[PDB]
Short mmCIF file of C-alpha atoms and ligand atoms in Angstrom, two decimals:
data_model
loop_
_atom_site.label_atom_id
_atom_site.label_comp_id
_atom_site.label_asym_id
_atom_site.label_seq_id
_atom_site.Cartn_x
_atom_site.Cartn_y
_atom_site.Cartn_z
CA UNK A 1 191.65 245.85 -69.40
CA UNK A 2 193.03 245.23 -65.85
CA UNK A 3 192.54 248.47 -63.98
CA UNK A 4 195.40 250.89 -62.53
CA UNK A 5 195.11 251.42 -58.70
CA UNK A 6 195.93 254.82 -56.82
CA UNK A 7 195.81 254.45 -52.97
CA UNK A 8 196.28 257.70 -51.52
CA UNK A 9 196.82 258.23 -47.85
CA UNK A 10 196.39 261.40 -45.53
CA UNK A 11 198.44 261.53 -42.41
CA UNK A 12 196.36 262.43 -39.22
CA UNK A 13 193.75 264.06 -41.47
CA UNK A 14 190.39 264.46 -39.65
CA UNK A 15 186.88 262.99 -40.56
CA UNK A 16 185.22 266.28 -41.61
CA UNK A 17 188.34 268.15 -42.93
CA UNK A 18 187.90 267.73 -46.52
CA UNK A 19 184.97 269.88 -48.24
CA UNK A 20 182.90 266.46 -49.27
CA UNK A 21 182.98 265.75 -45.69
CA UNK A 22 181.78 268.88 -44.20
CA UNK A 23 184.84 270.80 -43.71
CA UNK A 24 185.78 274.48 -44.67
CA UNK A 25 189.40 273.47 -46.13
CA UNK A 26 189.94 273.94 -49.94
CA UNK A 27 190.08 270.62 -51.27
CA UNK A 28 188.65 270.70 -54.70
CA UNK A 29 190.49 267.82 -56.24
CA UNK A 30 189.48 265.46 -53.64
CA UNK A 31 186.15 266.75 -53.43
CA UNK A 32 185.45 266.22 -57.11
CA UNK A 33 186.37 262.64 -56.73
CA UNK A 34 184.45 262.19 -53.76
CA UNK A 35 181.03 263.26 -54.97
CA UNK A 36 181.51 261.60 -58.18
CA UNK A 37 182.70 258.46 -56.06
CA UNK A 38 181.45 256.73 -53.14
CA UNK A 39 181.98 258.39 -49.86
CA UNK A 40 182.59 256.08 -46.39
CA UNK A 41 181.38 256.70 -43.25
CA UNK A 42 182.02 253.37 -41.43
CA UNK A 43 185.76 252.62 -42.87
CA UNK A 44 188.16 252.19 -39.97
CA UNK A 45 192.03 251.82 -39.52
CA UNK A 46 193.86 250.99 -36.65
CA UNK A 47 194.44 254.04 -33.98
CA UNK A 48 197.91 255.19 -35.35
CA UNK A 49 200.51 255.29 -38.58
CA UNK A 50 202.17 252.04 -38.89
CA UNK A 51 199.63 249.50 -37.52
CA UNK A 52 197.16 250.93 -40.16
CA UNK A 53 199.96 250.76 -43.05
CA UNK A 54 200.83 247.38 -42.24
CA UNK A 55 197.29 246.31 -42.45
CA UNK A 56 196.52 248.20 -45.60
CA UNK A 57 199.21 246.65 -47.36
CA UNK A 58 198.61 243.04 -46.21
CA UNK A 59 194.97 242.53 -45.44
CA UNK A 60 195.38 241.31 -42.11
CA UNK A 61 196.02 242.59 -38.55
CA UNK A 62 199.12 244.65 -37.15
CA UNK A 63 199.66 242.29 -34.42
CA UNK A 64 200.50 239.64 -37.05
CA UNK A 65 202.08 242.08 -39.67
CA UNK A 66 204.85 243.16 -37.35
CA UNK A 67 203.67 246.40 -35.77
CA UNK A 68 201.82 245.01 -32.79
CA UNK A 69 203.24 247.86 -31.21
CA UNK A 70 204.79 250.75 -32.75
CA UNK A 71 208.46 250.54 -33.17
CA UNK A 72 209.13 253.60 -31.45
CA UNK A 73 207.52 251.92 -28.21
CA UNK A 74 209.10 248.63 -28.19
CA UNK A 75 210.34 247.14 -24.84
CA UNK A 76 213.01 244.36 -24.13
CA UNK A 77 209.91 242.65 -23.01
CA UNK A 78 208.22 242.56 -26.31
CA UNK A 79 211.35 241.68 -28.28
CA UNK A 80 210.88 238.06 -29.63
CA UNK A 81 207.13 238.12 -29.93
CA UNK A 82 205.71 237.12 -33.14
CA UNK A 83 204.40 240.36 -34.92
CA UNK A 84 206.13 242.56 -32.53
CA UNK A 85 209.36 242.88 -34.91
CA UNK A 86 208.83 246.76 -35.43
CA UNK A 87 208.75 246.72 -39.22
CA UNK A 88 206.53 244.89 -41.97
CA UNK A 89 207.75 241.29 -41.12
CA UNK A 90 208.16 238.12 -43.29
CA UNK A 91 205.03 236.51 -41.83
CA UNK A 92 203.30 238.54 -44.39
CA UNK A 93 203.26 239.01 -48.19
CA UNK A 94 202.68 242.83 -49.21
CA UNK A 95 199.93 243.85 -51.73
CA UNK A 96 203.01 245.27 -54.13
CA UNK A 97 204.79 242.06 -54.04
CA UNK A 98 201.94 240.06 -55.33
CA UNK A 99 201.07 242.80 -58.10
CA UNK A 100 204.77 243.20 -59.41
CA UNK A 101 205.06 239.38 -59.90
CA UNK A 102 201.60 239.70 -61.94
CA UNK A 103 202.78 242.57 -64.32
CA UNK A 104 201.99 245.49 -62.53
CA UNK A 105 204.37 248.35 -62.19
CA UNK A 106 204.63 249.37 -58.44
CA UNK A 107 205.34 252.78 -57.79
CA UNK A 108 205.59 254.90 -54.44
CA UNK A 109 206.05 258.39 -53.24
CA UNK A 110 205.61 259.33 -49.58
CA UNK A 111 205.79 258.22 -45.84
CA UNK A 112 206.63 254.61 -45.37
CA UNK A 113 206.74 253.90 -41.53
CA UNK A 114 207.09 250.04 -42.07
CA UNK A 115 210.93 249.80 -41.42
CA UNK A 116 214.34 251.62 -41.65
CA UNK A 117 216.82 249.16 -42.67
CA UNK A 118 217.70 248.29 -46.05
CA UNK A 119 215.81 244.91 -46.49
CA UNK A 120 212.53 246.61 -45.13
CA UNK A 121 212.39 249.64 -47.31
CA UNK A 122 210.13 249.90 -50.11
CA UNK A 123 212.50 248.78 -52.51
CA UNK A 124 212.71 245.50 -50.87
CA UNK A 125 209.15 244.98 -50.01
CA UNK A 126 207.72 245.33 -53.53
CA UNK A 127 208.18 248.75 -55.27
CA UNK A 128 210.09 249.18 -58.45
CA UNK A 129 210.28 252.96 -58.01
CA UNK A 130 210.27 254.86 -54.89
CA UNK A 131 210.92 258.10 -53.11
CA UNK A 132 210.22 257.46 -49.42
CA UNK A 133 210.39 258.91 -45.80
CA UNK A 134 211.10 255.95 -43.66
CA UNK A 135 210.23 257.01 -40.16
CA UNK A 136 206.86 258.09 -38.97
CA UNK A 137 207.37 261.93 -39.25
CA UNK A 138 210.01 264.69 -40.07
CA UNK A 139 210.42 268.21 -40.55
CA UNK A 140 208.21 269.00 -43.95
CA UNK A 141 210.81 271.39 -45.05
CA UNK A 142 214.18 268.99 -44.18
CA UNK A 143 215.36 271.36 -41.43
CA UNK A 144 217.00 269.33 -38.54
CA UNK A 145 217.63 270.00 -34.94
CA UNK A 146 221.46 268.96 -33.43
CA UNK A 147 221.01 265.33 -32.60
CA UNK A 148 222.99 264.96 -29.11
CA UNK A 149 222.30 263.36 -26.01
CA UNK A 150 219.98 266.49 -24.98
CA UNK A 151 217.70 266.46 -28.19
CA UNK A 152 214.03 265.10 -27.43
CA UNK A 153 213.40 261.37 -28.03
CA UNK A 154 210.54 262.18 -30.31
CA UNK A 155 212.82 264.28 -32.53
CA UNK A 156 215.66 261.75 -32.50
CA UNK A 157 213.13 259.31 -33.66
CA UNK A 158 211.90 261.67 -36.38
CA UNK A 159 214.66 262.37 -38.80
CA UNK A 160 214.26 263.61 -42.52
CA UNK A 161 215.42 259.87 -43.58
CA UNK A 162 214.92 259.97 -47.06
CA UNK A 163 215.37 256.70 -49.76
CA UNK A 164 215.10 256.75 -53.52
CA UNK A 165 215.02 252.85 -54.66
CA UNK A 166 217.79 251.80 -52.68
CA UNK A 167 219.80 255.12 -52.50
CA UNK A 168 219.81 256.73 -48.66
CA UNK A 169 219.98 260.28 -49.79
CA UNK A 170 222.34 262.53 -48.72
CA UNK A 171 220.83 265.97 -49.14
CA UNK A 172 217.57 267.27 -50.20
CA UNK A 173 216.78 269.46 -52.92
CA UNK A 174 216.46 273.37 -52.56
CA UNK A 175 212.62 273.97 -52.02
CA UNK A 176 211.73 270.90 -50.51
CA UNK A 177 208.39 270.67 -49.04
CA UNK A 178 206.97 266.96 -48.55
CA UNK A 179 203.86 267.35 -50.04
CA UNK A 180 205.14 268.78 -53.33
CA UNK A 181 208.28 266.60 -53.40
CA UNK A 182 205.80 263.63 -53.13
CA UNK A 183 203.68 264.53 -55.67
CA UNK A 184 206.53 265.45 -57.90
CA UNK A 185 208.31 262.35 -57.70
CA UNK A 186 205.03 260.10 -58.24
CA UNK A 187 203.97 262.32 -61.37
CA UNK A 188 207.72 261.62 -62.56
CA UNK A 189 207.56 257.92 -62.13
CA UNK A 190 203.90 257.90 -63.69
CA UNK A 191 205.42 260.20 -66.76
CA UNK A 192 208.36 257.36 -67.05
CA UNK A 193 205.80 254.41 -66.79
CA UNK A 194 205.40 251.59 -69.45
CA UNK A 195 202.11 252.77 -70.67
CA UNK A 196 201.33 249.39 -71.94
CA UNK A 197 201.07 248.02 -68.57
CA UNK A 198 199.02 248.74 -65.49
CA UNK A 199 200.32 250.51 -62.36
CA UNK A 200 199.86 250.31 -58.48
CA UNK A 201 200.57 254.04 -57.30
CA UNK A 202 201.00 254.55 -53.61
CA UNK A 203 200.73 258.02 -52.33
CA UNK A 204 201.10 258.36 -48.55
CA UNK A 205 201.52 261.79 -47.73
CA UNK A 206 203.30 263.01 -44.66
CA UNK A 207 200.89 265.86 -44.13
CA UNK A 208 199.06 267.17 -42.44
CA UNK A 209 201.28 265.47 -39.40
CA UNK A 210 203.06 267.55 -36.88
CA UNK A 211 205.20 269.50 -37.18
CA UNK A 212 202.31 271.83 -38.83
CA UNK A 213 204.39 273.55 -41.48
CA UNK A 214 203.20 274.89 -45.14
CA UNK A 215 203.75 277.46 -47.64
CA UNK A 216 202.94 281.33 -46.32
CA UNK A 217 201.34 282.02 -49.50
CA UNK A 218 198.75 279.15 -48.74
CA UNK A 219 198.48 279.84 -44.93
CA UNK A 220 197.72 283.48 -45.85
CA UNK A 221 194.47 282.18 -47.64
CA UNK A 222 192.95 281.10 -44.30
CA UNK A 223 193.98 284.43 -42.29
CA UNK A 224 191.33 284.95 -39.58
CA UNK A 225 189.29 281.81 -40.47
CA UNK A 226 189.64 280.37 -37.01
CA UNK A 227 189.62 283.25 -34.95
CA UNK A 228 186.36 281.89 -33.45
CA UNK A 229 188.11 278.29 -31.92
CA UNK A 230 187.98 275.03 -32.13
CA UNK A 231 184.57 274.67 -30.52
CA UNK A 232 182.78 277.11 -32.75
CA UNK A 233 184.65 274.73 -35.47
CA UNK A 234 183.13 271.67 -34.04
CA UNK A 235 179.70 273.15 -34.54
CA UNK A 236 180.23 274.22 -37.94
CA UNK A 237 181.39 271.02 -38.66
CA UNK A 238 178.80 269.04 -36.97
CA UNK A 239 176.05 271.15 -38.78
CA UNK A 240 177.70 270.76 -42.20
CA UNK A 241 178.03 266.69 -41.73
CA UNK A 242 174.46 266.67 -41.09
CA UNK A 243 173.30 268.87 -43.92
CA UNK A 244 175.45 266.92 -46.31
CA UNK A 245 174.12 263.60 -44.66
CA UNK A 246 177.02 261.86 -43.50
CA UNK A 247 175.76 261.85 -40.12
CA UNK A 248 171.82 261.71 -39.00
CA UNK A 249 170.51 264.76 -37.84
CA UNK A 250 169.67 263.08 -34.21
CA UNK A 251 173.26 262.19 -33.65
CA UNK A 252 174.50 263.08 -30.02
CA UNK A 253 178.08 264.13 -30.17
CA UNK A 254 180.69 262.99 -27.65
CA UNK A 255 181.43 265.68 -25.26
CA UNK A 256 184.82 267.62 -25.87
CA UNK A 257 187.56 266.23 -23.33
CA UNK A 258 190.70 268.01 -22.72
CA UNK A 259 193.01 269.37 -19.67
CA UNK A 260 193.86 272.40 -21.65
CA UNK A 261 191.95 275.88 -21.35
CA UNK A 262 188.87 276.09 -23.42
CA UNK A 263 189.05 279.15 -26.15
CA UNK A 264 187.34 281.53 -23.88
CA UNK A 265 189.95 281.01 -21.03
CA UNK A 266 192.90 281.86 -23.25
CA UNK A 267 194.66 284.97 -23.62
CA UNK A 268 194.49 287.23 -27.05
CA UNK A 269 198.12 286.03 -27.69
CA UNK A 270 197.40 282.29 -26.80
CA UNK A 271 194.19 282.26 -28.80
CA UNK A 272 196.47 283.95 -31.77
CA UNK A 273 198.95 281.26 -31.62
CA UNK A 274 196.44 278.37 -31.49
CA UNK A 275 194.53 279.97 -34.48
CA UNK A 276 197.45 280.33 -36.51
CA UNK A 277 198.80 276.77 -36.06
CA UNK A 278 195.06 275.61 -37.35
CA UNK A 279 195.41 278.16 -40.24
CA UNK A 280 198.73 276.18 -41.01
CA UNK A 281 196.96 272.95 -40.76
CA UNK A 282 194.36 274.25 -43.25
CA UNK A 283 196.91 275.11 -45.67
CA UNK A 284 198.97 271.74 -45.39
CA UNK A 285 195.60 269.80 -46.16
CA UNK A 286 195.05 272.29 -49.20
CA UNK A 287 198.36 271.68 -50.36
CA UNK A 288 198.38 268.38 -50.05
CA UNK A 289 194.91 268.30 -51.85
CA UNK A 290 196.86 270.39 -55.16
CA UNK A 291 199.47 267.64 -55.16
CA UNK A 292 196.61 265.06 -55.54
CA UNK A 293 195.24 267.00 -58.47
CA UNK A 294 198.65 267.05 -60.05
CA UNK A 295 198.48 263.15 -60.15
CA UNK A 296 194.79 263.00 -60.90
CA UNK A 297 194.71 265.42 -63.62
CA UNK A 298 197.89 264.06 -65.56
CA UNK A 299 195.99 260.43 -65.36
CA UNK A 300 192.78 262.29 -66.58
CA UNK A 301 194.91 263.82 -69.60
CA UNK A 302 196.40 260.65 -70.28
CA UNK A 303 192.80 258.60 -70.36
CA UNK A 304 193.84 256.65 -67.64
CA UNK A 305 191.90 257.93 -64.95
CA UNK A 306 188.48 256.31 -65.51
CA UNK A 307 190.39 252.78 -65.51
CA UNK A 308 192.14 253.80 -62.37
CA UNK A 309 190.57 252.71 -58.99
CA UNK A 310 191.44 255.62 -56.77
CA UNK A 311 191.29 255.04 -52.94
CA UNK A 312 191.75 258.21 -50.52
CA UNK A 313 191.77 257.70 -46.91
CA UNK A 314 193.20 259.01 -43.64
CA UNK A 315 195.38 256.42 -41.43
CA UNK A 316 193.95 257.39 -38.12
CA UNK A 317 191.97 259.94 -36.47
CA UNK A 318 192.92 263.45 -35.93
CA UNK A 319 195.69 264.10 -33.67
CA UNK A 320 194.49 265.45 -30.43
CA UNK A 321 197.91 264.56 -28.70
CA UNK A 322 200.06 267.28 -26.48
CA UNK A 323 203.45 266.08 -27.11
CA UNK A 324 204.55 267.95 -24.08
CA UNK A 325 202.66 265.64 -22.05
CA UNK A 326 204.72 262.77 -22.30
CA UNK A 327 207.96 262.12 -20.64
CA UNK A 328 208.82 259.58 -23.12
CA UNK A 329 209.11 262.20 -25.96
CA UNK A 330 211.27 264.31 -23.75
CA UNK A 331 213.79 265.27 -22.16
CA UNK A 332 212.46 268.82 -22.08
CA UNK A 333 210.75 269.03 -25.28
CA UNK A 334 209.28 272.61 -24.58
CA UNK A 335 212.45 274.19 -23.48
CA UNK A 336 214.62 272.49 -26.51
CA UNK A 337 211.89 273.74 -28.87
CA UNK A 338 212.53 277.35 -27.07
CA UNK A 339 216.12 277.18 -27.74
CA UNK A 340 216.17 275.70 -31.10
CA UNK A 341 212.92 276.74 -32.73
CA UNK A 342 211.09 279.80 -33.34
CA UNK A 343 207.38 279.44 -32.64
CA UNK A 344 206.48 283.10 -32.07
CA UNK A 345 203.44 284.03 -33.98
CA UNK A 346 204.79 285.34 -37.25
CA UNK A 347 206.87 282.56 -37.75
CA UNK A 348 204.26 279.48 -36.85
CA UNK A 349 204.30 277.44 -40.12
CA UNK A 350 207.92 277.73 -41.36
CA UNK A 351 210.63 275.36 -41.29
CA UNK A 352 212.13 276.42 -37.96
CA UNK A 353 208.91 276.34 -36.23
CA UNK A 354 207.27 273.36 -34.85
CA UNK A 355 203.77 273.24 -33.55
CA UNK A 356 201.12 270.75 -33.08
CA UNK A 357 197.38 271.93 -32.51
CA UNK A 358 195.98 269.84 -29.78
CA UNK A 359 192.90 268.14 -28.43
CA UNK A 360 190.44 270.79 -29.01
CA UNK A 361 191.22 271.75 -32.67
CA UNK A 362 191.51 267.81 -33.04
CA UNK A 363 187.90 266.90 -31.79
CA UNK A 364 186.21 269.51 -33.84
CA UNK A 365 187.56 267.38 -36.77
CA UNK A 366 186.60 263.72 -34.98
CA UNK A 367 183.08 264.98 -34.15
CA UNK A 368 180.78 263.26 -33.24
CA UNK A 369 182.90 260.81 -32.36
CA UNK A 370 184.86 260.05 -28.95
CA UNK A 371 188.19 260.99 -28.69
CA UNK A 372 191.10 261.05 -31.36
CA UNK A 373 194.15 259.24 -32.71
CA UNK A 374 195.81 256.70 -30.60
CA UNK A 375 192.71 255.68 -28.80
CA UNK A 376 190.43 252.73 -29.83
CA UNK A 377 187.05 254.70 -29.71
CA UNK A 378 185.43 255.82 -32.83
CA UNK A 379 187.42 259.08 -32.91
CA UNK A 380 190.63 257.05 -33.14
CA UNK A 381 189.74 254.38 -35.73
CA UNK A 382 186.83 256.02 -37.80
CA UNK A 383 188.49 257.89 -40.88
CA UNK A 384 187.34 259.59 -44.13
CA UNK A 385 188.01 257.65 -47.12
CA UNK A 386 186.29 257.48 -50.73
CA UNK A 387 186.53 255.29 -53.81
CA UNK A 388 186.13 256.56 -57.38
CA UNK A 389 185.92 253.64 -60.18
CA UNK A 390 183.34 254.21 -62.51
CA UNK A 391 183.05 250.85 -63.53
CA UNK A 392 181.51 250.09 -60.24
CA UNK A 393 177.76 250.45 -59.84
CA UNK A 394 178.17 252.08 -56.22
CA UNK A 395 178.99 255.74 -57.01
CA UNK A 396 177.48 259.07 -56.22
CA UNK A 397 176.38 257.75 -52.85
CA UNK A 398 177.33 258.06 -49.28
CA UNK A 399 177.87 254.40 -47.78
CA UNK A 400 177.30 253.58 -43.98
CA UNK A 401 178.21 250.13 -44.70
CA UNK A 402 181.03 248.99 -42.37
CA UNK A 403 184.50 248.61 -43.93
CA UNK A 404 188.19 248.29 -42.87
CA UNK A 405 191.37 248.78 -43.97
CA UNK A 406 192.16 245.36 -44.15
CA UNK A 407 189.68 244.98 -47.05
CA UNK A 408 192.17 246.74 -49.13
CA UNK A 409 194.15 244.11 -50.32
CA UNK A 410 191.85 241.32 -50.94
CA UNK A 411 189.61 244.01 -52.97
CA UNK A 412 192.55 245.13 -55.22
CA UNK A 413 193.72 241.73 -55.74
CA UNK A 414 190.15 240.87 -56.73
CA UNK A 415 190.38 243.72 -59.31
CA UNK A 416 193.63 242.63 -60.51
CA UNK A 417 192.54 239.28 -61.17
CA UNK A 418 195.49 238.07 -58.92
CA UNK A 419 194.91 235.31 -56.21
CA UNK A 420 196.41 235.59 -52.70
CA UNK A 421 198.82 232.83 -52.72
CA UNK A 422 197.47 231.20 -49.52
CA UNK A 423 199.61 230.09 -46.58
CA UNK A 424 202.88 230.03 -48.48
CA UNK A 425 204.84 232.52 -50.39
CA UNK A 426 208.72 232.50 -51.51
CA UNK A 427 209.29 229.62 -49.36
CA UNK A 428 208.15 230.84 -46.11
CA UNK A 429 204.78 230.71 -44.17
CA UNK A 430 202.44 233.76 -44.42
CA UNK A 431 199.26 234.82 -42.97
CA UNK A 432 196.22 234.85 -45.06
CA UNK A 433 193.53 238.13 -44.88
CA UNK A 434 191.20 238.87 -42.18
CA UNK A 435 189.48 241.47 -44.59
CA UNK A 436 187.01 240.62 -47.26
CA UNK A 437 186.80 242.05 -50.96
CA UNK A 438 184.56 244.97 -51.26
CA UNK A 439 183.86 244.28 -55.06
CA UNK A 440 180.34 242.21 -54.56
CA UNK A 441 179.43 245.39 -52.30
CA UNK A 442 180.63 247.94 -54.95
CA UNK A 443 179.08 246.16 -58.02
CA UNK A 444 175.93 246.65 -56.33
CA UNK A 445 175.38 242.46 -55.98
CA UNK A 446 175.41 243.22 -52.07
CA UNK A 447 174.58 245.72 -49.76
CA UNK A 448 177.77 245.49 -47.76
CA UNK A 449 180.96 243.40 -47.59
CA UNK A 450 180.43 242.33 -43.87
CA UNK A 451 177.28 241.49 -41.91
CA UNK A 452 175.88 241.60 -38.22
CA UNK A 453 178.16 238.71 -37.26
CA UNK A 454 181.39 240.05 -38.38
CA UNK A 455 184.13 240.48 -35.73
CA UNK A 456 186.90 242.99 -35.92
CA UNK A 457 189.50 243.65 -32.95
CA UNK A 458 191.60 246.46 -31.75
CA UNK A 459 194.37 246.68 -29.65
CA UNK A 460 197.35 249.37 -29.15
CA UNK A 461 198.92 250.81 -26.05
CA UNK A 462 196.86 248.90 -23.95
CA UNK A 463 193.53 250.31 -25.17
CA UNK A 464 191.14 247.78 -26.51
CA UNK A 465 188.11 247.41 -28.75
CA UNK A 466 186.02 244.52 -30.09
CA UNK A 467 182.94 244.88 -32.51
CA UNK A 468 180.59 242.33 -33.85
CA UNK A 469 178.23 244.31 -36.23
CA UNK A 470 177.07 247.37 -34.77
CA UNK A 471 177.82 246.33 -31.24
CA UNK A 472 181.36 247.59 -30.05
CA UNK A 473 182.90 247.26 -26.67
CA UNK A 474 186.21 249.52 -25.65
CA UNK A 475 188.76 249.36 -22.90
CA UNK A 476 190.48 252.45 -21.81
CA UNK A 477 192.84 251.98 -18.84
CA UNK A 478 193.25 254.85 -16.37
CA UNK A 479 193.79 257.76 -16.56
CA UNK A 480 192.13 257.68 -19.99
CA UNK A 481 189.05 255.58 -18.81
CA UNK A 482 187.68 253.39 -16.53
CA UNK A 483 189.80 250.34 -16.67
CA UNK A 484 186.99 248.30 -17.76
CA UNK A 485 184.85 247.12 -20.91
CA UNK A 486 182.53 249.72 -21.81
CA UNK A 487 179.68 248.82 -24.49
CA UNK A 488 178.15 250.76 -27.28
CA UNK A 489 175.22 250.16 -29.90
CA UNK A 490 176.96 252.17 -32.68
CA UNK A 491 173.97 251.98 -34.91
CA UNK A 492 172.09 254.24 -31.99
CA UNK A 493 175.05 255.84 -30.46
CA UNK A 494 177.68 256.55 -32.77
CA UNK A 495 179.36 259.16 -29.83
CA UNK A 496 180.18 256.16 -27.52
CA UNK A 497 178.42 257.95 -24.85
CA UNK A 498 176.00 255.41 -23.27
CA UNK A 499 177.65 252.39 -21.81
CA UNK A 500 175.27 249.52 -21.96
CA UNK A 501 177.75 247.19 -20.03
CA UNK A 502 175.18 246.75 -16.95
CA UNK A 503 172.31 246.62 -18.81
CA UNK A 504 173.52 244.26 -21.61
CA UNK A 505 175.93 241.84 -19.70
CA UNK A 506 175.02 239.08 -22.20
CA UNK A 507 176.35 241.03 -25.27
CA UNK A 508 179.03 242.22 -23.52
CA UNK A 509 179.98 238.60 -22.67
CA UNK A 510 179.92 237.49 -26.19
CA UNK A 511 182.16 240.21 -27.38
CA UNK A 512 184.52 239.50 -24.81
CA UNK A 513 184.68 235.90 -26.01
CA UNK A 514 185.50 237.54 -29.42
CA UNK A 515 188.08 239.40 -27.71
CA UNK A 516 190.01 236.42 -26.36
CA UNK A 517 189.96 234.84 -29.92
CA UNK A 518 191.06 237.84 -31.63
CA UNK A 519 193.76 237.85 -29.21
CA UNK A 520 194.85 234.52 -29.77
CA UNK A 521 194.76 234.52 -33.58
CA UNK A 522 196.61 237.70 -33.80
CA UNK A 523 199.15 237.37 -31.19
CA UNK A 524 198.00 240.40 -28.89
CA UNK A 525 200.47 240.87 -26.05
CA1 CA B 1 199.08 258.88 -38.75
#
């Protein structure tokens, strides 16, 4: 009996946000899956959305698969470079393409971020039914600003661009809210399925990505919950992570780094607005979980859930960016929002608000890790993940076994009984996976899918990392870092605090040789 797959991806959700990962946010559906399943604490993505998604659906690195950098960041200089096409390219075959030609029904509702053009949509790349937001973000209610010369580039790049199969949509339905619409559509496609054949269901939410927006009735459940601020929260999260066994009691958390004012330096009005942004975030996460519950509860009542491999993950670390801090996102983002949105306290969270919660709230959720989204430190690339599938032996536990998002395609092919086609598919050259199937590990035959000699690289925006076993070197250029390689023993120092470059040069030099091979093999520019 071939299993079904349900692959759920949160957008910018933090490590300790979910209850079963140490958080205060109501996530009852995900908690039940997590505690019955396997919770992963050493599972990694890339540091932002589209790199990670290209890896998820191929089993190889984003510099091969077409998102060598984010499409939104491409330059004339990068044009023509293999794997910097700005969309999922044809140097790869996608997981749904392989499963569909083997009898699986491929169903998707959510954010794509792997191409905007017709030949790059889910319908072109293996999904028989799909309801999708093509860009990397959008207003969750479909409220659009005017688009003219004056519009900030970050808003120009995030329109509410939706497609259903081949149909680029003209209007969005009344009551549109991104998470609810994705739950509604995937539920529709499941109810309409051929019940005599398995499905591959992909549920990439755009929540809890900015702009932070959620139903007022849910935000109201969190009124006052965050009045003590993001460092009080970080302390609550760290304590809970340790109580639950997700982090060891002796772990030294990375200090919090922000150019903004600390909570106690803020004025009452400023704190109230920041706390409300976190209340709205919490509601986004709760409402995402509610929609997950609708899908999972349907499958449960169908008697399909126990034969469904359920994977939940976030796509990168929590979002600590200050969007106002980047001229590339402008011009004049704050002024534009002042003149076109209403970010006053009582409107934060509504369709015509536009807020993001900033670096201190983000680092509460990445703690004890260093930094957050778009960095190659663990705060950017270690994300929460769970697997619920009762056939497998390793269930009910917390695992600190090393894993990455590139392992997912090989694992699901393995479970599906489908071989990766090798180096050719549909008359073209394609890449072979760099990840490894989890089935030996999850069946109890081995302790992990990787070992102390496994080598994994990362690069984005000029930031780098290279890992072998539990040794990891990081390169952060100015003014994000010292502009030289730093070396961490993640087994002793998960916070990437103690730079061993000077005391262990032999190890660093080994990892630099691995970095150079990673560059060569994947086409890093
Ligand atoms: Ca993301």
